[model samples]
Target: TMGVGLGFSTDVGARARFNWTRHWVNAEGHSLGFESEISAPRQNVGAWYEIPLDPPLTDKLRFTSGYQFEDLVDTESKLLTLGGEWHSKRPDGWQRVVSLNWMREEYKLGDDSGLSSFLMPGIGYSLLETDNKVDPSHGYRLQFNVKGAKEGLLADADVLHVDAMAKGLTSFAGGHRLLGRLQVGGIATNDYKSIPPSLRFFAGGDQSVRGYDYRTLSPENSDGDKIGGRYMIAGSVEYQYPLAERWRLATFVDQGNAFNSLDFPSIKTGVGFGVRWVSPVGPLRLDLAHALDDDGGFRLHFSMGP
Candidate 1:
């Protein structure tokens, strides 16, 4: 399959994107694809080649490569990665990953200038359980991943990255539903600037803490650049009451932040109410959120997903 998109706006200037994918089934388990997004501020291009590992059904190996560029007010940078990952399924809602990769990042501002390279190795595990794929009455998902590189490991700086997340949804008291999420991550390195922006963490925005701008909850450099973070923690809890055959009302609280130091970090909060429509494909949501911060601002959010 192949798809392309093009768009233009006063603020965006002009942007375009393209995606291609193909997969073979049964005796021939081969998957390959190219995906890319190009815009004024950021661009990403990636492709992967995969072949079923000997035990086909449960194991496969994939070789992937990608290049990305981002130009934020804080800084401008480029990243390149080449990697191979081994995937294995453990049956009954469990999966695992093992990877070996090489990465290079270049930046043009602050101490983040110059180029840094690393030979990183990683491992990951995930579990998922749900009654339905789109609208689940009961479900849970948990994931944990760790990636690291040693100093001088291919001219690299010491690095250790870890992140974990868990989400749960349950229905009770008739059609009423409850959902909650928890996410936490951290990076350990000799120098924060030595790590790439893509390896760092940031929180806020629609998929993050609502009411706050996306990726704005992070520590800044001496130059006030949102250089990302070394630590991050965020969570959300929501309640929904069925309203009609295709509608519902929701209330939720979300809080979290990313910081270089957790010793004296400031965790922001947001509370909001939302309307949900169960469309044929998925749920469409509109939210009115208020940030419980000094500014105490309000914002509206509209999104569609499971």
Candidate 2:
């Protein structure tokens, strides 16, 4: 199968993706397939091999191995990864994934290169009772993740990172519904300068603080360039009402920022309203937002989902 898409945002003028997937082998409920995606601002090309474990765990356990090259805006990275996922048998809806990768990264701006091998692990649990996964009318979802890298284990520096998020939805009388979200993340590393830019925390943009430019809510250097931050916080509240079947109207307020310290970080806020269309894939959104603290004019935001 193949797919293609095009998108636009304030940061990346335009973005596109082309992807293909094939299931070439199947036996004993174990199928093997390959998948690749080509896209930008980071164009990633990769292939993976996967197989399910024996029963008791059959459909619940799987392993994957892949090699990929990523052409990023400020760096290029190549890596080989091996990973596994476990789908909890509990009725409570839980999943865990762990992966390790050996990577070589080169910075385009500074012409620097480095090698590292690290393990990344993440877990998620959902308790939402929504009618749709893409466009939930009611329910809640929470997720957490952590990544660790050690210097001696084929890595250049030691770093520990963690992130958490919570989302909720509720409906009141008269077809009125409310949605809210909170997200926070931080990274701890003695050698901050050695941490890769991708490992740092950033905010601003769709799915984040909506008023500012994407990934632009971070500490800046003397030259006014965003140097990713160590800690970040963001929250959003939205109200929606049904206009008709599969159609809704929404208004939201979002606030947050990325900063090195939490003591007294400055927070930026955005307010906007938009229309929503419940498509097969998700809730398509088109919003007009204005920055509350800056002279940022109205921004036209387009995206999918919560």
Candidate 3:
């Protein structure tokens, strides 16, 4: 069959997607798919072959391989990936995925280019006792992962990275609810300059620190281009009250930054209030945030969820 989709965001502008899928080589329970997507600053086309596993892992294990060409903000990347995912049979909602990829990238900033092969493994657990994952009013979710790339693994540099995030929602007696989030990320490499910009930590965006512009909270080059950072931290607290069915009023404060070191980086803050419309997919958010550290005026943020 075939499908089409559309999306929009403050950062990426508008997006469109098309996809097609069919059974693989007359094999039952195996399939292949092709997808193409285009957005304001990016375009991607890829095809994947999927094979379902058997037994206790039956329907729980999936293997996939794909090739993709992507044009990103300031770079172009071509990737070949072989990956697998295991949906845990545990009662606790745990899942794991691992992938090996060969990537060739070209950067526009300094006219830099490189090729690398990386092994990425990640595990996550979800605990959602809320009525809905889309508009969660209670419970919490946390996820963390580490990634490493070694020169011996056909990589340009040796890199180690860690990232984690936790989000919680609590409901009060007066039809009020509180939402909190904390996110942290760090990278270690002998030559940080050799790491791809897309792999580095960046802050300041609708999903990040709202007051600043998207990816503006990064270490810049002499030309004032955001090249990304080695460490980053961000936290947010928001309070919401019901206005009507599926509608809520929200106010929030966010602080975070991307920096070269962990040596007491200057944290930036943003404060704002907005409205939330609980949609089938998630909470549609519209906020007016102001940067407290920079001279940025009130900025409008439109997005999904906190």
Candidate 4:
């Protein structure tokens, strides 16, 4: 899947995006591990705009609005988001950015299936200099992000949640690179309300702890009962290199844990390899990862850039 954008004027542009994916498995001949049977498919499309608000502060502020549609298996979803971004320059390889956004979602499964809405405000600081130009040496970056959500709607009720993440990247010897990230956060709902059933921390995936499947590491209390998220942590390291001007290869190890009440003997880990293509627009990547615990199987993922 890919997307494209076109400039209609100095500060105005239009964008279009499309995505499709399919996966299937058969295990009649042999033991396929955790997956008894599997078939998943999805498609998504969206359009967006950039509206400049003030002339003098034209570059400082802009209004953005977009519409998106997504289908996952039998469920379909639609969303609209309105947001604005603020940017500023800093000295000593540092920059500041802040964003405010509101989103409304409608799910086809009826009211019980629920609708989700939230308003989020976030701030980020980056200690990396690209000078708005690509770094041939492919330097590195360190960043911190924090965001909070106020009231929510429908299924997303009890929307008071705070999230924070710290991420770092650096180039190493043999064209290898070191990448590390950690995030900890949680949500608070009614007594019987768990992690929104949709907001719980998930581990074990291409971008998360590799040794398991997506959302496999559900947080649980000491009594072995499921509970909402209170805290989550993940860390990973990867080595990358340009196999050719148009191709890149990488290998990585990842680990993470999500918990309820922040206590339990839980551990997850995985290892994987992947490839990247220097596409015309950007970089396209694919990864196949497997978790070590529970004899979990492998997962294949596709995405753009890092």
Candidate 5:
């Protein structure tokens, strides 16, 4: 990795990660990349070759290939994936991604295991909007995706995936603001039991359910493992009120959970209040949140630049 362009970045997570990438461009507007993600749960090393389908940056084709290693509490997987994607940018800030991917996975879950090949085709749409970037006054963002695999056509099981999330922020009088968010996801597969934890939905986190811990609200197996779920729904409603010129108070409600049942899905709710102070860098908040369930308890969270 001696040269050919060198750099690295570490991002916040505690949930730690290291990303290193090098890129080179050729004469015909084609580029080659080497990229990696180093983290606790998984390690990814990938490379891509991209051709400018002219409109250049507006339209492109990419061949992506990677090898991944993963381990959760109760499962482990090592996979090799090869894929190609087409990117098209649309008006109104919307964008489209279409991809075809093939993967070979050797996976183990507890005493169960499989070595299978899967081929999937997918399409996704995404967009971002913000009125003011320096200090956003109103904003909205959303993404939706779908993918499928056919069992008899090379895959061990039939699979379908759906994922979407929408978020909005609007300003009001009195230096107040309103924010709303919605999330929904589902996965349909004949071999649901063999589905790995990485593909499943999990709830509860600082950005998710403040009263609960991260990624803990999900369906469990008979062995009491948090195995994740087939369906997930979560939403947040929040408002901020100005107290002083540089101070504001906030309150919010968040509800969500991931479960196997669509009709009888049990939901979890969290209610919280926070105090905010405007610092030179950004606004910082301290919140006390309480879950509504009888066995639930209160939790505290601190954040900045929200």
Candidate 6:
């Protein structure tokens, strides 16, 4: 019914960060929060940072790691990821960023131990354009990433995925504004089976083919062959208008999907709409979306972030 929330981030080093976030549902409602850190990379292996924020905001040196072991399948996996983003304060409406990440996945079945390792480097450029300096209206960005992997029983399998995106913000009639975005990307894999499960596309979630439960819905027979080495395309549009200073209404349609091959059943598209509240940290959004041409109920989504 009524609430307030606060979020804060501070950067202490180029490769370290400190962050704390909290949420308040309603008066005397549930409160949830978490604190995490990003450690500096050593040599070429480490752990992935918690959030994807540019210009990390912490400096204390710390290390956090986890491993999973399945005795039934005799599968033991080890993962190490490390990276942090750097943001620029340059002029000419430009913001530059760079990040590095590395991970290792392992599976052991008898003497046949499967292992895969990968390193990802990402570079991006964002343009700041808006009528009001406080709120950006129009923006453009480009990002490039290079990945290298090893293959073997705990060896490395190499692959590459490149993506490009362009978006703009504009005002329309009826006191509404239109937000447009287009993204075209492709992936190249040497060994499809070696791709990590977390990195591979499996529909569901607020951002993916939003008709079924997150990660529970997938293409017909993707799990069989452990599909990989494919491409995907994405596009989205959102229209928004103000009902009051604290309240806003929005409708959006998004299209995107992943494919095992370039053939039949290209990227499947999902369309949906939602509303937002001008909360303290950012706009809190609620949306309902469905996959086109599928006999599934609409997926409800709730999130907060600018």
TM-scores for the candidates: 0.89, 0.83, 0.84, 0.61, 0.81, 0.62
lDDT tens digits, residue span 89-190, model 1:
876767899999998888765455768888899999999999976568999999999999888668467889999999999999888999898999999988
Global fold similarity of model 1 (TM-score) = 0.89
> Could you give the candidate ranking by TM-score, starting with the highest?
1, 3, 2, 5, 6, 4
In model 2, the worst 10-residue window by lDDT is 101-110
Q: Write the per-residue lDDT of candidate 4 for residues 141-235, one digit (tens) a residue.
A: 66666655644433344444555566565666765555666655565555323223334555555556665655456655455543334557677
lDDT of 2 by residue, 1-306 (tens): 666766554545465655555554666454454555444554555454555553345235556666556553334556666666665534455544444445544432225555545565545443434577544557877787777777877667777888889888888897789989999999988887667666777788888988777777887656566667899999999999889988899999999998997786788899989898887755678888998975667888878545
Q: How high is the CA lDDT of each candidate model?
A: 0.83, 0.70, 0.73, 0.54, 0.78, 0.51
Give per-residue CA lDDT, model 3, range 110-134, as digits (tens): 3566665566554544444456745
Sorted by lDDT, highest first, which candidate order results?
A: 1, 5, 3, 2, 4, 6
Cα lDDT tens digits, model 6, 35-149, are 3333221112222223323233321112234333322221233455544455554657555555555556665423345666766655666664656643555444444443434
* Model 4 misplaced regions, further than 4 Å: 1-59, 66-79, 92-100, 105-112, 115-120, 130-138, 149-160, 165-167, 172-174, 183-185, 188-200, 220-230, 241-248, 276-286, 299-302
Alpha-carbon shift of residue 260 in model 5 (angstroms): 1.0
Candidate 5 lDDT over 155-230, as tens digits, reads: 8788898999999988888568888989998999989875765567888766666677766788877877777789
In terms of lDDT, the poorest run of 10 residues in model 3 is 54-63
Model 6 worst lDDT run, 10 consecutive residues = 8-17
Poorest lDDT segment (10 consecutive residues) of candidate 5: 3-12
User: Number of the top candidate by TM-score?
Assistant: 1
Pairs of residues at least 3 apart in sequence or in different chains that clash in candidate 5: none
After superposition on all CA atoms, how large is the RMSD of candidate 2? 3.3
Off by over 4 Å in 2: 1-14, 18-24, 34-40, 54-89, 108-129, 132-135, 279-282
Residue ranges of candidate 6 with Cα displaced over 4 Å: 1-78, 83-101, 107-114, 119-123, 131-134, 149-155, 215-229
Q: Residue 92 error for model 5, in Å?
A: 2.6
Shift of residue 283 alpha carbon in model 4, Å? 3.5
